[PDB]
């Protein structure tokens, strides 16, 4: 058998990181240790570390991956067995990283298969969860049906010959959805790189699939880093492929399916970068590893006490975010209170009580009232800005449709409307038409709003200030 070298390779990789892996420590045992209780079966592995200890299995890896891939799961099980009293429930999801090379939609051939390469793009026209019971139990009809075998191939075939008997070899048993092997994925599409925008041809799009742990964490407007698992796609039927056709005409001595395969692509790693914020228990650049209410929520108390104690820090902070700016010193102290919290009471079922406050700017022309806020989109989280006429009243509403795509009437979102606990300010409040204006007339105060003419029980809500 071919990949027994890969077996021993990741075996003794385990056996090394069974000892230390990094400075008397291991980076992929405590993830596995957290795994041991629920047994969720996802562990990313550094690709650098193959070159560290295994001495360039990368080229042993990055071509015959698709065939080698399954053996990594057996390797995973062999890892978990060594110290845990183990059953073979264990599985292998991977979310690979620490990989250098970054190729795009153009270097595509028959020669690109079984790799781990990292690739980006865009996210469009997403699509939902759609499960899969890939496996089950199936053989002849009478008694000899206990079948946890390898029957989980994409091309699925109930028909199996026999295990114990001479019995039916096309008449199958019935099915198992109870104690067998199942899993999940979804399916979405991707457009050409906006970092690679040439002329001429279209945005050639790729098909894409996601395993368990990858799921519902892709999203429109985001670039990525995939695996390089380009496929032979177990397709079923297609037209225009009028090449030569073949099939095994067996030995002469004294079923058919037309063959035209198409392409798609699969991936088992993501770093949805440019879309990552982190609240306060994330250790930042400047921290103080201390004890606190939570991990890093205020473990820099060692200074934040000081930044909460001075009678000077009021004015200093008023001057600690307008270094490049000079004007009055009243909005320079008031505007932060818009970003600063409100009331946050703990009280009755009377009605929603609000924390936020309305806020304004007026001024004569060319006073850099814009530059106050041009940065604020770059500043706060949740709080991205554009203008109101920067879109239509498909800013407040969605784009009103009168053609059939899914159920022929869709207004279920907007542009103001997705600013939950961030502000999406606007400019030019004087010449804008009196539609969103009277919408805001109550949408700011009574943050619980409705529409008609296309309503799926229309009840939406504003959340922030202005």
């Amino acid at each position: 058998v071919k990949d027994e070298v890969g077996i021993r390779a990741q075996k003794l990789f385990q056996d090394f990181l069974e000892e230390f892996k990094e400075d008397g420590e291991i980076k992929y045992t405590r993830p596995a240790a957290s795994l041991e209780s629920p047994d969720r079966c996802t562990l990313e592995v550094s690709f650098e570390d193959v070159e560290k200890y295994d001495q360039n299995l990368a080229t042993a890896i990055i071509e015959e991956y698709y065939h080698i891939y399954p053996f990594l799961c057996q390797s995973v099980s062999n890892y978990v067995k060594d110290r845990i009293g183990l059953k073979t429930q264990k599985d292998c999801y991977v979310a690979f990283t620490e990989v250098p090379t970054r190729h795009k939609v153009r270097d595509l051939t028959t020669s690109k298969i079984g790799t781990l390469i990292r690739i980006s793009g865009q996210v469009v026209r997403t699509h939902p969860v759609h499960p899969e019971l890939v496996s089950g139990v199936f053989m002849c009809l009478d008694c000899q049906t206990e079948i946890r075998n390898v029957e989980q191939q994409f091309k699925f075939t109930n028909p199996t010959i026999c295990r114990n008997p001479v019995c039916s070899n096309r008449k199958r048993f019935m099915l198992d959805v109870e104690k067998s092997l199942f899993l999940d994925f979804q399916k979405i599409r991707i457009q050409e790189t906006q970092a690679e925008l040439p002329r001429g041809c279209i945005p050639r799009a790729v098909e894409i699939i996601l395993r368990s742990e990858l799921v519902e964490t892709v999203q429109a407007g985001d670039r990525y880093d995939f695996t390089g698992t380009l496929i032979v796609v177990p397709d079923v039927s297609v037209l225009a492929g009028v090449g030569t056709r073949a099939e095994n005409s067996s030995r002469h001595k004294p079923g058919m399916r037309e063959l035209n395969y198409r392409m798609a692509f699969l991936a088992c790693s993501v770093q949805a970068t440019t879309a990552r914020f982190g609240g306060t228990d994330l250790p930042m650049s400047e921290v103080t590893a201390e004890d606190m209410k939570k991990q890093m929520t205020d473990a820099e108390w060692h200074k934040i006490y000081e930044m909460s104690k001075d009678r000077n820090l009021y004015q200093n902070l008023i001057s600690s975010l307008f270094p490049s700016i000079y004007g009055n010193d009243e909005v320079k102290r008031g505007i932060l209170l818009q970003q600063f919290g409100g009331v946050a009471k703990t009280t009755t079922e009377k009605t929603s009580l609000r924390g936020d406050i309305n806020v304004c700017i007026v001024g004569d022309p060319s006073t850099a009232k814009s530059q106050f806020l041009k940065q604020v989109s770059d500043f706060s989280p949740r709080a991205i800005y554009t203008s109101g006429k920067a879109s239509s009243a498909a800013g407040l509403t969605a784009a009103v449709v009168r053609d059939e795509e899914s159920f022929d009437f869709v207004i279920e979102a907007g542009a103001l409307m997705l600013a939950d606990n961030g502000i999406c300010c606007i400019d030019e409040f004087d010449k804008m038409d009196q539609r969103d204006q009277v919408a805001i007339h109550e949408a700011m105060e009574q943050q619980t709003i409705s529409i008609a003419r296309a309503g799926v029980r229309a009840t939406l809500n504003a959340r922030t200030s202005i």
């Binding site: 996210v123 457009q191 001429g200 056709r245 073949a246 095994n248 067996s250």
Partner: protein, 626 residues
């Protein structure tokens, strides 16, 4: 005594005669034929080219049959009728030619052979039965660039007992198997899997016939082609390209529920070779790596920089022949040398690009549309749209169905392809308010954040203007300034940096000079490299190279003049319904300044740029003293 069944060929004849022909070769196809010429090579071009290519070690030759005319055309004809039987022998001759070149060379990376040049057949319209296995070559216009597809010749196999894990490939369409693969005793049945096996790429695209070689007043009936590995996406759409191939006929399946077969064989051409035809006259694209210049050109570039005449030279080299009142072409040239890069990777704050924004506006007399139709044949990111060519969504979100996915997709735009570029634009006062409230967003923030039911985006978009706006009038009305003549608001009209005004030249006289000279320009249909020394490309890298290695910096020079004179520059508070001076002007002044220091390549500040800036201003800021 050996030849294929339905043929009259023999392979040793063709290979031997081609080998003798290349040996009987001193580049005679243009050293004996073009004997007036003499390539200084009294050696075959072919062993010379195996040297040129194995010294380069970048394989994949090409041939042409004009070389192969002078030899006995028995090779030529029996390559015509049997090209699938005579082509690869040329590659075998190449295989021995390696040995002629080098014995131990890379004798495993293989060479193409791409002949052509018998003649145009005629054109697509007029074909016959007999031209089915022959040599054809026409061209026209392109439709598409479609996606690529593998194609097998083999499978992968498996087993249960001892793991008979094997393969076997295809001849073309007929395969064998035991009850196993590598069968011994038949311990199981045959296991076949379909992935870990042999594949080949190829792809098909559709192609037209549309030069003016038309059945005139007829739509061009179009052709079709496949592709093969080394010719796959050899061309992108909207090109005219030559074809070299062999006609290829194919049945159609009657019905489909059964295996019946229809009378009409469909025909296409296979692929040997094509001729991608390039026409990029204007100032070329922006890869950066594939454009680097030599030091010898840097000599001439800094030579150009060594002229104080350079302040006017390139502005004078803007027009091909136009010699009236170019006094703005200096103001053009600050965008020719398209702006400075005052980056904001420094503080993370306030992101003030050296935004350069100027438009031309005036009467119809000025050749704004035609000048700038030619300047479309200058600008690297040349665009040309205008009022009522495309809507706001005609600039962005070209969203609709895609039968490639069998689904609809979120899709394309216009401006984000033209970052840093220009679109020559006219008829500005033509659009709905839907557009032109986008331009406020970009002209004032140079941004975009988008929200639709599908994808929601915060992209990046940013570039500089050219435009050729017009009024609601035919002539700019005397005693009614463009302060209101062109159709815009009260101080948004004032908002622009400065639009260097245009208008008809109010002087009857000067018509005759150029009505005669620049008609004689046509009458001769050529130019002269007079004092207007039109550089072939010596102008074009001072354009190109001077976007990148330059970083204007301010020490003390080009700032302080209006930093004094702002007293009366902001005594402007007085005025009834007017528009006046504002403290955005100097931003534009610094930007102009670093721009004009781009010319002269002054890494530190230029001071004269202020003086031409003040000139630029007060030549066209006193157009409304009223």
């Amino acid at each position: 005594q050996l030849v294929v069944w339905g043929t009259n060929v023999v392979v040793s004849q063709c290979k031997s005669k081609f080998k003798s022909f290349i040996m009987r070769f001193i580049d005679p196809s243009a050293e004996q034929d073009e004997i007036s010429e003499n390539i200084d090579v009294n050696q075959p071009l072919y062993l010379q080219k195996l040297e040129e290519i194995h010294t380069l070690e970048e394989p994949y030759l090409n041939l042409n049959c004009a070389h192969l005319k002078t030899f006995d055309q028995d090779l030529y004809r029996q390559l015509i009728c049997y090209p699938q039987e005579v082509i690869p022998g040329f590659d075998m001759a190449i295989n021995e030619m390696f040995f002629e070149r080098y014995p131990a060379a890379l004798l495993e990376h293989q060479i193409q052979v791409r002949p052509f040049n018998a003649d145009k057949t005629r054109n697509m319209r007029s074909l016959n039965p007999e031209d089915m296995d022959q040599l054809i070559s026409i061209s026209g216009m392109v439709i598409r660039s479609s996606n690529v597809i593998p194609e097998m010749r083999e499978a992968f196999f498996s087993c249960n007992i001892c793991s008979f894990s094997t393969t076997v490939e295809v001849d073309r369409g007929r395969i064998n198997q035991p009850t196993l693969c590598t069968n011994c005793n038949t311990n199981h049945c045959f296991r076949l899997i379909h992935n870990r096996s042999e594949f080949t790429d190829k792809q098909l695209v559709k192609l037209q016939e549309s030069p003016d070689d038309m059945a005139a007043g007829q739509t061009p009936h179009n052709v079709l082609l496949y592709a093969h590995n080394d010719l796959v996406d050899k061309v992108q759409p909207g090109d005219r390209v030559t074809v070299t191939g062999i006609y290829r006929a194919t049945p159609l399946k009657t019905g489909g529920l059964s295996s019946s077969v229809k009378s009409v064989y469909k025909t296409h051409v296979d692929v040997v070779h094509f001729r991608k035809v390039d026409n990029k006259r204007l100032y070329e694209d922006e890869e950066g790596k594939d454009h680097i210049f030599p030091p010898e050109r840097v000599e001439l570039l800094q030579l150009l920089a060594k002229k104080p005449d350079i302040y006017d030279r390139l502005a004078r080299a803007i027009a091909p022949s136009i010699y009236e009142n170019d006094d703005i072409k200096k103001g053009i040239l600050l965008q020719l040398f398209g702006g400075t890069k005052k980056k904001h990777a420094t503080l993370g704050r306030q992101n003030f690009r050296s935004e350069i924004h100027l438009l031309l506006c005036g009467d119809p007399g000025t050749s704004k549309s035609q000048m700038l139709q030619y300047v479309f044949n200058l600008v690297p990111r040349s665009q040309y749209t205008s009022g009522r060519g495309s809507s706001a969504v005609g600039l962005t979100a070209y969203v609709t169905k895609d039968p490639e996915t069998r689904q609809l997709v979120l899709q394309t735009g216009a401006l984000v392809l033209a970052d840093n570029g220009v679109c020559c634009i006219d008829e500005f006062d033509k659009m709905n308010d839907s557009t032109r409230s986008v331009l406020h967003e970009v002209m004032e923030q140079q941004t975009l954040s988008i929200a639709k039911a599908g994808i929601i985006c915060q992209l990046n978009a940013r570039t500089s203007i050219l435009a050729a706006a017009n009024p609601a009038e035919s002539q700019w009305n005397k005693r009614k300034n463009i302060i209101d003549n062109v159709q815009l608001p009260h101080t948004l009209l004032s908002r622009f940096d400065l639009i260097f005004l245009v208008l008809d030249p109010q002087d009857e006289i000067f018509d005759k000079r150029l009505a005669s000279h620049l008609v004689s320009l046509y009458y001769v249909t050529r130019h002269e490299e007079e004092d207007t020394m039109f550089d072939m490309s010596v102008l074009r890298d001072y354009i190109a190279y001077a976007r990148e290695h330059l970083s204007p910096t301010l020490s003390d020079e080009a700032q302080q003049r209006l930093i004094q004179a702002y007293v009366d520059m902001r005594k402007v508070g007085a005025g009834r319904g007017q528009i006046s001076a504002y403290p955005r002007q100097l931003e534009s002044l610094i930007r102009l300044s670093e721009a004009h220091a781009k010319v002269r390549l002054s890494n530190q500040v230029e001071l004269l740029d202020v003086e031409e800036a003040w000139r630029l201003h007060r030549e066209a800021l006193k157009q409304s003293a009223t």
